[PDB]
Amino acid sequence: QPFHCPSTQWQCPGYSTCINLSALCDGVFDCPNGTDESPLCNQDSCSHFNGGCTHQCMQGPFGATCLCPLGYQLANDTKTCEDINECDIPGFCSQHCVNMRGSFRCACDPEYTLESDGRTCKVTGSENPLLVVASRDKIIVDNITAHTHNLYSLVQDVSFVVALDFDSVTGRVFWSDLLQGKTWSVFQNGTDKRVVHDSGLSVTEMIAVDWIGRNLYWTDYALETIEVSKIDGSHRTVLISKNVTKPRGLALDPRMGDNVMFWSDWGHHPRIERASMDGTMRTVIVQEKIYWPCGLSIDYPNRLIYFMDAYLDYIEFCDYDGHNRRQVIASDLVLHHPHALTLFEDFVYWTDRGTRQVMQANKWHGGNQSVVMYSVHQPLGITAIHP
Amino acid sequence: XXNXX
Amino acid sequence: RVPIVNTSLVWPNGLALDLETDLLYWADASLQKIERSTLTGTNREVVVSTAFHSFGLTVYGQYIYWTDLYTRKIYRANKYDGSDLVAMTTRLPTQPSGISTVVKTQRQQCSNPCDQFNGGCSHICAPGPNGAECQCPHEGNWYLANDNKYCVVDTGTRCNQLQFTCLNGHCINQDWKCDNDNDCGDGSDELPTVCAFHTCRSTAFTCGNGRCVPYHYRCDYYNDCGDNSDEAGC
Amino acid sequence: XXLXXX
Ligand SMILES: *[C@@H]1O[C@H](CO)[C@@H](O[C@@H]2O[C@H](CO)[C@@H](O[C@@H]3O[C@H](CO)[C@@H](O)[C@H](O)[C@@H]3O)[C@H](O)[C@H]2NC(C)=O)[C@H](O)[C@H]1NC(C)=O
Ligand SMILES: *[C@@H]1O[C@H](CO)[C@@H](O[C@@H]2O[C@H](CO)[C@@H](O)[C@H](O)[C@H]2NC(C)=O)[C@H](O)[C@H]1NC(C)=O
Ligand SMILES: *[C@@H]1O[C@H](CO)[C@@H](O[C@@H]2O[C@H](CO)[C@@H](O)[C@H](O)[C@H]2NC(C)=O)[C@H](O)[C@H]1NC(C)=O
Ligand SMILES: *[C@@H]1O[C@H](CO)[C@@H](O[C@@H]2O[C@H](CO)[C@@H](O)[C@H](O)[C@H]2NC(C)=O)[C@H](O)[C@H]1NC(C)=O
Ligand SMILES: *[C@@H]1O[C@H](CO)[C@@H](O[C@@H]2O[C@H](CO)[C@@H](O)[C@H](O)[C@H]2NC(C)=O)[C@H](O)[C@H]1NC(C)=O
Ligand SMILES: *[C@@H]1O[C@H](CO)[C@@H](O)[C@H](O)[C@H]1NC(C)=O
Ligand SMILES: *[C@H]1O[C@H](CO)[C@H](O)[C@H](O)[C@H]1NC(C)=O
Ligand SMILES: [Ca+2]
Ligand SMILES: [Ca+2]
Ligand SMILES: [Ca+2]
Ligand SMILES: [Ca+2]
Ligand SMILES: [Ca+2]
């Protein structure tokens, strides 16, 4: 062998010098760094009742070491092994993580099927999602067919579309026109452009249909109200009016267990508000570190409300009560002026009025960022059409 | 644009 | 001259080096990202996924500072993962270009071989990976003659290994160096630069001042050792 | 960009 210490003489790390084997923790620094007097020395051998380790044991030249099986970790003082709480790291398991003694159990909603790995699940349907965005002149729908994005216009007579939402029961796409002051509806195939609201709207920010109760909710910035109406627009009433300054966002959870609504207000003292539909159980859930809140979306399997910010430039989520607030994209220059938000499986899609782009990223950590499309005008609304 | 000073 | 990273760079305006961990940082204006790697360029990674039109870059402590031409500000982020991204300045009236740190503590120091007799080079030397590397001035046509230690005019008259090249282009035989006889005329073959590392033929005699003479030049017709050591100690 | 869409 080339010049080193190939014999049993204990070589110091990185040096061409080796020392006697008796040097180990004998009281005098013998290696240039004193590796013989290692920081991990004077630990009893494993003959000392397994060295106190709760699992498999090692008694190498540097005192002793306790090792743990997969899914376990060492304690601070290396006394005992400790379990990893795999559900305490967000995004580890897509839905419904359960912690075991040394492992984890996962399950997904009846609309999802678990994959080979017991963490990720995908939609059970055979139909790919559609991404619909609202450019000023036209509505642009993206055929999401295995990353083979295909832009095409949905409707032609649009002049200024701001809000977007869809009804899965009838397969229609709803949008509001700012210049016309009307709310429309059409089939996903671009046929049957029929009006639903023809008057009484000034600046409709977002539209959220109630697909269980067949209702239609929307926020009007000029009127400073949250309004509800039948899905065909027959019977309109004002739902929320007390302290509603500049309502922008709106999300719904029509499942009977929840039956809850959320909206965002960016007036003085901006906040995210939670209330049961019909507006009885009204409360504020997010009022800290908020400035110009914009856009809302709900992770239905996990019951998390995703929200965005245009002044602080972040994307966050929290529980229905506002607790467990977490950041997915924060302190990142990628956000300039995000407006609207949309979720699907494990991806999050948002429209940026600054960069004039609609983007994508991991809805748990904000990585895997990519660009969906470039828009000539500011993209205002966005929604994902999928059962 | 231009990668000047 | 070899390339370190060469796959996907477009507009690498900024470059910085961290002596504390021996990692290399750089910034791209078009890709709009700041990347780190080892000095060999193996463990390539992205530190900041969006940095706009960055021009300058500098790492001090735990943060990397870079100026942005598009948004005329100075930013910073954690050197390992790009966290804690904040803007040091407001939007400056003009585009900031170039950035550096003023550090009072002396940086890493190593013994310069050029500090000893100019490292044996003739005009300009710099410390290389193994030793001092000689170099020639920017004006004139030169070539690294005489064991790459001597810069001589490039007239094309390359001369034999059995000869010692002078600054005048004259190649006396290689045995004539450092014998305190100005065989070059201008004393180039007798300068202290070469005599500090030259040595005396085994069939010759070594002078105290570093010169070399054949044995029949000791205690002989005339003194030619330079310090009277040939005539002394016969 | 100002936040007011109008
Ligand atoms: C665009 O999509 C819409 C909605 O699918 C199409 O309109 C109508 O959709 C229904 C869906 O059931 C088609 O099926 C018909 O349903 C009735 C339900 O009672 C049934 O009685 C009929 O025998 C039939 O199965 C219906 O044919 C269709 N209407 C028309 C005009 O064909 C619309 O056709 C689609 N347009 C394009 C561009 O294909
Ligand atoms: C847009 O997406 C739709 C829905 O997935 C695609 O429609 C199906 O595509 C498959 C594969 O080409 C066909 O075998 C089916 O017959 C299609 N069904 C219908 C209802 O058309 C469509 O192909 C996609 N188009 C593009 C441009 O990717
Ligand atoms: C609408 O706004 C007013 C003003 O913020 C609210 O009145 C405050 O309510 C809190 C209790 O949540 C009191 O502690 C404050 O003293 C009240 N301030 C004032 C100036 O009255 C009011 O509760 C809000 N009403 C609704 C329907 O939400
Ligand atoms: C972006 O997506 C890629 C996969 O397309 C992720 O790559 C994984 O990165 C982790 C952390 O480095 C590795 O442990 C995995 O082995 C990688 N898997 C694959 C398939 O490449 C990546 O994590 C995503 N973005 C991030 C957060 O880096
Ligand atoms: C980019 O860099 C790599 C080296 O890291 C180049 O690869 C070398 O290319 C030369 C021929 O030009 C070969 O003789 C070497 O053997 C290659 N080295 C290795 C390790 O593969 C590569 O050619 C460079 N590409 C460009 C565009 O310059
Ligand atoms: C372990 O030690 C570190 C450093 O002292 C401390 O910050 C951390 O909170 C400790 N963790 C536990 C679980 O004790
Ligand atoms: C003197 O000896 C050294 C060491 O052996 C080198 O070989 C040097 O090149 C010698 N000097 C001459 C005559 O070139
Ligand atoms: Ca010792
Ligand atoms: Ca576990
Ligand atoms: Ca902003
Ligand atoms: Ca001479
Ligand atoms: Ca003599």
Secondary structure (DSSP) of A163-199: EEEEETTTTEEEEEETTTTEEEEEETTS---EEEE-S
Q: Which atom of ligand 7 is nearest to the CA of C201?
A: 13
Q: Is A159 in contact with A144 (CB distance < 8 Å)? A: no
Alpha-carbon distance C49 to nearest alpha carbon in chain B (angstroms):
19
CB contact under 8 A, A369 and C49: yes
Q: Where are the beta strands (DSSP E) in C95-209?
A: 124-127, 132-135, 142-144, 150-153, 163-165, 171-173, 205-206
Residues A78, A84, A89, A92, Cα dihedral to 10°: 140
Measured CA to CA, the distance from residue A249 to residue A266 in angstroms comes to 9
Pocket of ligand 1 (CB under 6 A): A 171, 187, 189, 191
Taking residue C26's Cβ as centre, other Cβ atoms within 10 Å add up to: 21
How far apart CA A341 and CA A378 sit, in angstroms, is: 14
Shortest CA distance from C11: residue in chain B = B3
C186 close to C166: Cβ distance less than 8 angstroms: yes
DSSP type of residue C210? S
Residue of B nearest to C68 (CA): B5
With contact defined as beta carbons under 8 Å apart, do C191 and C183 qualify?
Answer: no
A310 contacts on D by Cβ (under 8 Å): 3
Structure letter (DSSP) for residue A12: P
From C34, C59, C58, C56, select the one nearest C45 (Cα to Cα): C34
Chain A with chain D: Cβ pairs closer than 8 A? 20
The position carrying tokens 């929307």 is A218
Long-range contacts of A319-323 (CB under 8 A, 24+ apart): A320/A253, A320/A258, A320/A260, A320/A274, A320/A285, A321/A274, A321/A285, A322/A272, A322/A274, A322/A284, A322/A285, A322/A286
- One-character DSSP codes across A254-321: -STTT-EEEEEE-SSS-EEEEEETTT-S-EEEE-SS-SSEEEEEEETTTTEEEEEETTTTEEEEE-TT
- How far apart are the C-alpha atoms of C177 and C194, rounded to whole Å? 8
Which residues neighbour A109 within 8 Å (Cβ) at sequence distance 6 or greater? A95, A96, A300, A301
H or E stretch at C128:
none
Owner of token pair 């036209």: A138
- Find out whether A161 and A381 touch, Cβ atoms under 8 Å: yes
Q: By what technique were these coordinates determined? A: cryo-EM
CA distance A339 to A333: 15
Cβ(C79)–Cβ(C85) below 8 Å: no
Length of chain D: 6
Please say whether the beta carbons of A264 and A294 come within 8 A: yes
Distance of CA A58 to the CA centre of its chain: 42
Neighbours of B1 (CB within 10 A): 8
C-alpha C63 to ligand 10 mean position (Å): 23
CA of A282 to the centre of ligand 3 (A): 12
C50 burial type by CB count under 10 A (0-12 exposed, 13-18 middle, 19+ buried): middle
- Helix ranges (DSSP H) in chain A: none
User: In terms of DSSP H, where are the helices of chain C?
Assistant: 145-148, 192-195
For residue A25, give the DSSP letter: T
Question: Cβ contacts (< 8 Å) between D4 and chain A: which residues?
Answer: 221
DSSP notation for C24-62:
EEEEETTTTEEEEEETTS-S-EEEES---SEEEEEEETT
> H or E element: which one contains A337?
none
Name the nearest CA neighbour of A272 among A254, A295, A253, A255. Answer: A295
User: Encoding tokens for residue A359?
Assistant: 């983007």
Amino acid symbol at A374: Y
Backbone torsions φ then ψ of C201, nearest 5 degrees: -45, 145
Cα A237 to Cα A174, A178, A208, C168, distances in angstroms? 19, 20, 15, 103
Kindly give, in sequence order, each residue whose CB lies less than 8 Å from that of residue A188, ignoring residues fewer than 6 positions away.
Answer: A130, A141, A154, A166, A171, A172, A173, A385
Contact A216, A210 (CB under 8 A): yes
Q: Which of C112, C123, C120 is nearest to C195 (CA)?
A: C120
C58 touches C48 (CB < 8 A): no
**How many residues are given for chain C?**
234
Shortest CA distance to C32 belongs to which of C48, C44, C56?
C48
With contacts defined as CB-CB under 8 Å, which chain C residues touch A331? Answer: 83-86
Ligand 2, pocket residues at CB < 6 Å: A 127-128, 143, 145, 148, 150
Question: How many helices (H) and strands (E) in chain C?
Answer: 2, 16
* Token pair recorded at residue C158: 């390359």
Q: Provide the token pair at A147.
A: 């990353």
State if residue C6 touches ligand 5 by the CB under 6 angstroms criterion. yes
Identity of residue C169: G
Contact C97 B3 (CB under 8 A): no
